[PDB]
Design a protein around this ligand. Structure first.
Ligand SMILES: CC(=O)SCCNC(=O)CCNC(=O)[C@H](O)C(C)(C)COP(=O)(O)OP(=O)(O)OC[C@H]1O[C@@H](n2cnc3c(N)ncnc32)[C@H](O)[C@@H]1OP(=O)(O)O
Lengths: 316, 114, 56, 316
């Protein structure tokens, strides 16, 4: 299901599908499929550049929410192996809006923590649209401590609309849990790398994003507040979300100059959704490179550097 | 007034008084973020939401602070965190409990991810 | 409370996000009225720092 | 409300009450109150020894459950000052079946953790008969960590029927919380003293009772299982509880020989309930003496001694 501005790409795709049927549909129909396929694929490839060259911040947000995209499960599958999912906070529940586990990266063992919006409606409602109740963040703290204890690096993916705004979420110390998370992660003796795949932000995202390095795709928005919220509070409306997106600076290159993120991982054309494997390979390369130049530093120097980088936050 | 109320008299020492907003996001809202910054600064008489004042409690050294909610909802601006760090550093260098009071409506949106 | 009201599209519990409610729900230690505050901080800190008790 | 075997004591008390009325009731009645008061008090004092000399383990259990007795609140009031009650686990609730706080003992600051059955029916149901849901034990862990951090000794009172056997208690990791409690308390760098005031046991009691010293009143039962439970499972009945109490060895002197508890604090005659102030003074003296000979040892030697004492557990 392509977005509104990806229409010319769609109709060309719509002609492309029935090519399979015409191959063996009925009445002996087996036409010269290869010629038409090649011409239509050429046109489609040419047109996507005609479509994805002129997208800006409001679009970037739409693309960051494309309802066909790799979630943390997808990146785990397409760049990680021997994945073991640990579920359980030890207190009140395991949460489906966060998925964590311990896996191997090119032999090396790692910890993977991140969100999972679910693909279709069913897995979206079963995972609460990637909105974690605090018990999830307590689980994430528990896993992060486990990873710290056994001299293990931590790889974290961040793809959350935000911490759930609900009765159950507020009752259980949402603020307290996120505060603790932000406290412990800033003392681990192991390197930390955190991407911004997909749509993330709204503070709750930061619960698992305080690390040595930070990386973001080219169509991923990292906003202290969703554009619609900023629009409602400030613009006194919702339709004016694109203006809020333009003003805030939620796009990766805008953030990059702000010394906030350490690298942008380029996407396959038309969005990572068109070539999830290519995006997974790019992410794996970026993660490995980040880990490499990180392992040289010792644990004490690692923590000191982490603290120093934090203090660089804010123009002050 | 809060800091005076808690701390003893004559031992008050403000911290991070030279830190002032230095907006770079030039946030263009219905108003200009500089407009609200200046308006709040003049209306409340304080540079930012947070004030820090080293002092003493019943003869015991201590560091306190508080939020002036009137300042744009007392949002945690860059200066807010910088003064917080300054106070915590003062407490660390000189062994003395550090105290604070919370009053805010959320982080300073106009500064976005900062 | 407005955000939660629109999200859950329901009636929030009475005393929502109230200190008299967040001490009921474990997130809040002790409810102190402002007049005691300075003594309450002074006594607690003089205890924790292990200093002699303050003189009224 | 005295127990069944304290009847002769009662009726003598029942005659004693209306002495106040006869002093100024009506018809100019002001009799020679002092003579009758002295004689009846003499008889009552003589009779209690005639009553509390011949009580054994099944009784001890009844006395340990006398519905007129000092709970942890009472001992705090009558032996501690500048008491500050911290309530809150930080996760899901503060529990009324446990009361903790930070107070001063003869100038010295301490931490007090223990249970509170509530006096009457209302405060009994509001505190769940001193039965703590796990969140209570998480709170107790939190307080114990706080006390450890600031070089502060811990005084703990133990008066619980047991961890609550309920849906809500089991759902929230009861076993997990108690396991963690039993893990952390065995690593604190501060001395720990734990009494057995009132009725305690059933494992959940041990959640706050793993310390350098252990002390118990003369009418306090510390059983891995209530006598009634042991009776039901083993004796195949409930009426045979006294036999279970006799067999198990739940009485303090029986436990004392077992190298399980380090001292018994003698009670005022007729039970501590008759002279709560005397019991509070005795407890305060015992606590201070325990702390004294404990502070001599350094933190490392303290923890080593604690570990060694634990290993002495069990004849093996
Ligand atoms: C996502 C974030 O962290 S910021 C999101 C905004 N905050 C929240 O969602 C949490 C609470 N939301 C609120 O609206 C309030 O803080 C409440 C619920 C406590 C209500 O308190 P109120 O008495 O209504 O205060 P109010 O919101 O009017 O704050 C006073 C002023 O501070 C401003 N303000 C408050 N918080 C912020 C903020 N984070 N950014 C910018 N301005 C802010 C308001 O715009 C308002 O300005 P105005 O009076 O000139 O229009």
């Amino acid at each position: 299901n392509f977005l509104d501005f990806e229409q010319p790409i769609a109709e060309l795709e719509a002609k492309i599908d029935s090519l399979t049927a015409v191959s063996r549909q009925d009445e002996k129909l087996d036409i010269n499929i290869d010629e038409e396929v090649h011409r239509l694929r050429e046109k489609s490839v040419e047109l996507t550049r005609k479509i994805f060259a002129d997208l800006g911040a409001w679009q970037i947000a739409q693309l960051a929410r494309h309802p066909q995209r790799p979630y943390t499960l997808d990146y785990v599958r397409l760049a990680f192996d021997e994945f073991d999912e640990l579920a359980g906070d030890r207190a009140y529940a395991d949460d489906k809006a966060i998925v964590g586990g311990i896996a191997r990266l090119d032999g090396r063992p790692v910890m993977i923590i991140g969100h999972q919006k679910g693909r279709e409606t069913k897995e979206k409602i079963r995972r609460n649209f990637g909105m974690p109740a605090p018990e999830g963040y307590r689980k994430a703290l528990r896993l992060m401590q486990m990873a710290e204890r056994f001299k293990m690096p931590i790889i974290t993916f961040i793809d959350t609309p935000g911490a759930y705004p609900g009765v159950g979420a507020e009752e259980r110390g949402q603020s307290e849990a996120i505060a603790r998370n932000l406290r412990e992660m800033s003392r681990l003796g192991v390197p930390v790398v955190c991407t911004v795949i997909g749509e993330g932000g709204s503070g709750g995202a930061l619960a698992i994003g305080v690390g040595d390095k930070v990386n973001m795709l080219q169509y991923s928005t990292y906003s202290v507040i969703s554009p619609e919220g900023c629009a409602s509070i400030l613009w006194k409306s919702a339709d004016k979300a694109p203006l809020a997106a333009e003003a805030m600076g939620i796009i990766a290159p805008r953030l990059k100059e702000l010394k906030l993120i350490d690298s942008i991982i380029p996407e396959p054309l038309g969005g990572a959704h068109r070539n999830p494997e290519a995006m997974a390979a790019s992410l794996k390369a970026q993660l490995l490179a980040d880990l490499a130049d990180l392992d040289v530093l010792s644990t004490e120097d690692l923590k000191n550097r982490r603290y120093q980088r934090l203090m660089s936050y804010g123009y002050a | 007034n809060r800091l005076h109320s808690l701390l003893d008299e004559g031992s008050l020492v403000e911290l991070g008084s030279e830190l002032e907003p230095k907006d770079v996001l030039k946030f263009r809202d219905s108003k200009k973020y500089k407009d609200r910054l200046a308006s709040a600064q003049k209306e409340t008489g304080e540079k930012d939401a947070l004030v820090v004042m080293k002092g003493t409690l019943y003869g015991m050294p201590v560091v306190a602070a508080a939020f002036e909610f009137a300042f744009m909802g007392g949002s945690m601006g860059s200066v807010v965190g910088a003064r917080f760090v300054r106070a915590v550093e003062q407490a660390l260098e000189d062994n003395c409990p550090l105290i604070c009071f919370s009053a805010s409506g959320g982080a300073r949106m106009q500064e976005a991810l900062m | 409370p407005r955000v939660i009201e629109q999200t859950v599209r329901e009636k929030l519990p009475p005393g929502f996000q109230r200190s008299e409610f967040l001490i009921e729900k474990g997130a809040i230690d002790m409810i102190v009225r402002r007049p005691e505050m300075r003594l309450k901080l002074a006594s607690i800190l003089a205890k924790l720092m292990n200093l002699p008790a303050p003189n009224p």
